């Protein structure tokens, strides 16, 4: 019987991450046919952000790609990459996960059991509403979703707006009932999951990102046969050029399907107004020294 490796993540099949996870399985059938299957299961349809890293532990799953702004429980060395306006553009990311200091992080979660394998890019996070975003005042007392992070949760506080945890998969139906009424995300996310039919203004904000780390369970990578896992990191290495490569594409794409869409409209910011945001924001980071 072949080596099965179930990859659950949360975003739609049209996405970076999404690409990303069919890439590698394809790869995977045709480099080791019959010895390693690849099964793929998108948009939450084995496990959401909920219970997905509980499952991986388990062993019910062997490969997941969350956001880096969702390892909270696992290690803290992660949320730097969840501080607004730290990193510029996606080459800055770049940049920090792919030095020296950016690997060790891939094993801040070994003593876990979680091992990470390579960091995907998704893009960077603009903000949505149902009124206009000019300048930081005009979030007060709004109630944006965030993902399950510390660091997400203070950011809107320091914009005096309430922010709720919540669930991927529950975005739309939140701010659908209204529990939320703005948030974060990248175009594609935004896009992919229709969040733009219940959001009319878009600020075009880049105030932080979106990316991934791709992860295993240790016991699971470690107890493969030598070859599996090291032609297995091979692959991985090869289909993370092609995923951040495309992805400020499939981003680009997603905006202008925002534009076409009718419903929605996007605030640009010229550098000073982004100065002006950024000033309002970067206080938090006293918060997380």
Same mark, same amino acid.
Do not use: C
């Given at each position: ?8 993540? *949360? ?9 990303? %996870? =069919? &890439? ?7 480099? #080791? /046919? ?58 800055? *990311? ?9 690997? %060790? =992080? &891939? ?7 979680? #091992? /990470? ?173």
């Amino acid at each position: 019987q072949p080596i099965v490796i179930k990859f659950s993540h *949360v975003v739609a099949e049209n996405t970076p991450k999404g690409q990303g %996870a =069919l &890439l590698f399985k394809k790869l995977v059938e045709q480099r #080791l /046919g019959g010895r390693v299957e690849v099964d793929v299961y998108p948009n939450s349809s084995l496990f959401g952000d909920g219970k997905e890293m509980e499952a991986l532990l388990l062993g019910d799953v062997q490969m997941l790609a969350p956001s880096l702004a969702k390892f909270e429980q696992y290690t803290r060395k992660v949320q730097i990459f969840d501080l607004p306006f730290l990193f510029d553009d996606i080459q800055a *990311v770049d940049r920090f996960q792919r030095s020296p200091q950016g690997r %060790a =992080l &891939l094993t801040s979660m070994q003593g876990k059991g979680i #091992l /990470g394998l390579a960091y995907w890019h998704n893009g960077m996070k603009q903000l949505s509403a149902n009124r206009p975003l000019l300048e930081p005042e005009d979030a007060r007392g709004l109630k944006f979703r965030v993902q399950a992070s510390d660091v997400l949760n203070e950011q809107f506080r320091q914009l005096r707006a309430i922010s709720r945890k919540m669930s991927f998969a529950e975005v739309y139906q939140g701010l659908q009932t209204g529990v939320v009424n703005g948030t974060e995300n990248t175009w594609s996310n935004y896009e992919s999951q229709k969040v733009n039919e219940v959001q009319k203004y878009f600020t075009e904000s880049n105030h932080g990102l979106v990316d991934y780390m791709v992860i295993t369970n240790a016991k699971f990578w470690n107890g493969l046969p030598a070859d599996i896992r090291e032609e297995l990191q091979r692959i991985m290495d090869e289909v993370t050029v092609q995923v951040n490569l495309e992805a400020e594409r499939l981003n680009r794409d997603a905006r202008q399907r925002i534009l076409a869409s009718g419903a929605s409209e996007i605030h640009t910011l010229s550098p000073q107004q982004r100065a002006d945001w950024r000033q309002a924001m970067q206080p938090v980071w006293q918060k997380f020294r």
